[PDB]
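The freezer alarm interrupted the setup, so I double-checked each line after restarting. Inputs confirmed:
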Amino acid sequence: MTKQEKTALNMARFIRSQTLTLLEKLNELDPDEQADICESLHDHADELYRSCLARF
Amino acid sequence: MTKQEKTALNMARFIRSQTLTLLEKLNELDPDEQADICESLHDHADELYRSCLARF
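Predicted 3D structure, all chains:
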């Protein structure tokens, strides 16, 4: 278990935690607003993915 | 422009900001770790989406 591996795992734990907080907050908005936010999260996750592939 | 609309927009601005920070940090991990994190973000965005649809 390298230090960097611990950092990657912490990042994953952070994302899981943040996601649960977002669910709680989204429940406070209207359906269409929830849809807009979820779409943005999805699109941003994919741009990150392509950005990592590009910087290779 | 309702208060709730301002909250939704702030949430979007927060997600954009967090995403840019994640790009910076992912560049510090190995390719396979980057792939693992990006996949988790993508899967979590979709679970959120389905969770919002379910709670309707």
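Quick read of the result. The domain at 1-56 of chain A is CATH 1.10.287.230 (Helix Hairpins).
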